[PDB]
């Protein structure tokens, strides 16, 4: 979805001069406008140039204007990356996050995901997904896509996972898992909860919430159970986890507040009961695929509007600059 | 009267120095984690913040992994959570991120507060921003997290004195004298102060 | 003398020789010395118990009140004294101390019982 964007509007097409200016600004320890950065981003037309731009971005991030790094600039950068290589450099930036200060909580992410899908690369995609999760996102319908990707990854990834990875997986499951419309979403959520529960029990409660959008409160297994029950009112992995748990420093929890390692048999029983109920009443990848096939009516008008707004803003900025020059 | 020009000049110079080469707080809010001391100053931290220092995070660092520097978000102090049943947090309206720090963190930030689920209009500058007792509140279960629903005797002698005075005046008045703490509020010790009023090193 | 905004304090002061402590309760500047100058002297306190077991304390309550109004803080001993008088409430620290003492006594009693 490229040709809607490629009316960028014209500016200066000399990068060396811009670079020099930037250096001078930094030499003096003076601030830099966002506009210049945007222009720089626009200009790029080589891998060396891309590298240079990256550096410049980093510098900006470490300056009196850490903020003002506008969405539009980020978008432009992403586009540039896509045009050239994309899957190493953008990813790297995302990983760095705080240093390049890119924070593209937008359709950019979706685009990136799509690109990744187009040229296989699974690990990278997973990483991207994780990064997105770490950022507070998931108002848009890319959530489904993310979930699908996660599922795909899981379909390959079937070992002991390990500390960070399990947590990441759980996070991925959870935040995109807000799909009240279908039982698949609920299942995903449950799975996520189970993973998180496992993490809690093996290692610690702090291990779960430390860096993630996740909440300190102890009952994760309980929460999962509740969620499951809700569905009934209106899994294998979870069972396995439970079984494992059953099989044979500071304290955030209280003396009165009961320890969840000493609530296991009861929990297991509850789970069993729930399962029975489900059976009485009455694959994941397939479901996800089906979902994908349905739905997906896009956000293109909105995107266009946003672009227009950005353009307007740019124009305003230019005008301001002109005024300043006149004054000078 | 002689004029002390030199002294004045010196003072001016000092002021200038303060204005200019003042430590951008990347330097002086740093922490060596293994020895639990500090660059620039050299002094240790107190014992009752060692574990906390080790295994939890700065506010600004937390913010640093968000778009717009998490300008429209909730955020909590771990201590508050430990202490109170009630929901206790700030929401942001601004960030002053100290740029000199590699992986941006440390500086200043602020917005609206609510201690024990009682909000305040207007945005102060918020205290304890460089402490390590902080946690970020996710947007999922944000509204789940934020859920909320007189008179005393005088001391022995004063009261007696008052009574005596009354008697002297003339009136008998069997109604006893009493003081009222409806006016006198008791904002707790863990209630935060204001960074506008404090001075930086 | 000009100090850096030192608050006012109603405080004790040693007016005694060695081994005879005698006290002077006094409204003074926080950053003044102990036996140095003051704003207005108030009621002298004696800690050593005089003839027939009295430990006498003066207080110009009328002027103490005035001082308090004018925004003069109280040192802990002063507060305790006030509490004792009935002018202030019993300082909770005193109460806690008393409790501790009681506990100690109880313990001692228990020990004695055990012995016997």
């Amino acid at each position: 979805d490229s040709h809607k964007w490629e009316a960028r509007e014209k500016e200066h097409y000399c990068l060396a001069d811009l670079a020099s200016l930037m250096d001078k600004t930094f030499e003096r320890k003076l601030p830099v406008s966002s506009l210049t950065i945007s222009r720089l981003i626009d200009n790029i037309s080589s891998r060396e140039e891309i590298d240079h731009a990256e550096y410049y971005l980093y510098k900006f991030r470490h300056s009196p204007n850490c903020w003002y790094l506008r969405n539009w600039t980020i978008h432009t950068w992403i586009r540039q990356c896509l045009k050239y290589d994309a899957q190493d450099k953008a990813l790297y930036t995302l990983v760095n996050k705080v240093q390049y200060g890119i924070f593209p909580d937008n359709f950019t992410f979706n685009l990136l995901m799509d690109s990744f899908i187009k040229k296989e690369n699974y690990k990278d995609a997973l990483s991207v997904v994780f990064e997105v999760m770490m950022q507070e996102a998931f108002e848009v319908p890319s959530t489904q896509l993310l979930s699908l990707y996660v599922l795909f990854h899981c379909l390959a990834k079937k070992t002991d996972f390990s500390w960070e990875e399990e947590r990441n997986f759980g996070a991925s499951l959870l935040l995109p898992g807000l799909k009240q419309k279908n039982s698949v979403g609920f299942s995903s959520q449950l799975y996520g909860y189970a993973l998180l529960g496992k993490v809690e029990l093996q290692q610690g409660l702090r291990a779960v919430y430390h860096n993630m959008p996740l909440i300190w409160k102890p009952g994760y297994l309980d929460r999962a159970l509740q969620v499951m029950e809700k569905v009934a009112a209106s899994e294998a992995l979870d069972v396995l986890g439970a079984v494992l748990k059953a099989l044979t420093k500071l304290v955030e929890q209280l003396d009165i507040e009961e320890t969840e390692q000493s609530k296991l048999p009861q929990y297991l029983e509850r789970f069993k009961a729930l399962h029975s109920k489900l059976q009485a009443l009455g694959l994941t990848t397939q479901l996800v695929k089906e979902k994908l096939s349905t739905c997906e009516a896009e956000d293109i008008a909105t995107y266009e509007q946003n672009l227009q707004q950005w353009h307007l803003d740019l124009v305003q900025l230019i005008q301001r600059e002109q005024q300043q020059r006149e004054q000078a | 009267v002689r004029p002390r020009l030199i002294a004045e000049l010196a003072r001016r110079v000092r002021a200038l120095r303060e204005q200019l080469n003042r430590p951008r707080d990347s330097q002086l809010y740093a922490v060596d984690y293994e020895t639990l001391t500090r660059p620039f100053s050299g002094r240790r931290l107190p014992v009752r913040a060692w574990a906390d220092v080790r295994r939890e995070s700065r506010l600004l660092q937390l913010l640093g992994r968000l778009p717009l520097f998490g300008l429209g978000r909730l955020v909590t102090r771990k201590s508050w959570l430990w202490q109170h049943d009630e929901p206790c947090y700030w929401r942001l309206t601004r960030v002053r991120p100290d740029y000199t720090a590699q992986n941006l963190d440390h500086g200043k930030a602020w917005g609206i507060l609510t201690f024990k689920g009682k909000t305040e209009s207007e945005a102060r500058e918020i205290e304890h921003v460089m402490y390590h007792d902080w946690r970020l509140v996710p947007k999922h279960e944000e509204e789940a997290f934020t859920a909320f629903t007189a008179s005393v005797p005088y001391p022995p002698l004063l009261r007696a004195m008052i009574i005596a005075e009354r008697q002297k005046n003339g009136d008998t008045s069997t109604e006893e004298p009493m003081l009222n703490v409806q006016r006198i509020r008791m904002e707790p010790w863990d209630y935060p102060a204001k960074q506008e009023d404090k001075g930086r090193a | 003398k000009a100090y850096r905004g030192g608050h006012l304090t109603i405080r004790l002061a040693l007016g005694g020789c060695t081994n005879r402590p005698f006290y002077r309760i006094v409204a003074a500047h926080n950053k003044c010395p102990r036996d140095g100058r003051f704003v207005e002297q108030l009621g002298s306190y004696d800690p050593l118990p005089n003839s027939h077991g009295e430990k006498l304390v003066a207080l110009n309550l009328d002027r103490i009140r005035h001082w308090i109004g004018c925004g003069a803080h109280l040192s802990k001993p002063m507060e305790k004294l006030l509490g004792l008088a009935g002018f202030f409430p019993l300082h909770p620290m005193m109460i806690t101390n008393a409790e501790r003492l009681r506990r100690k006594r109880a313990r001692e009693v228990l020990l004695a019982s055990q012995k016997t």
């Binding site: 500071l250 304290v251 209280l254 003396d255 | 202490q83 | 009681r102 506990r103 006594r105 009693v109």
Partner: peptide, 29 residues
């Protein structure tokens, strides 16, 4: 105190604590 408060206190001062009585006596020989 209510037990919750006590628990909280304990949590706060994990390593540094003392075992205690409830109320004190009401006499002292």
């Amino acid at each position: 105190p209510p037990e919750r408060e006590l628990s909280r206190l304990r949590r706060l001062y994990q390593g540094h604590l003392q075992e205690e009585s409830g109320p004190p006596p009401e006499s002292m020989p």
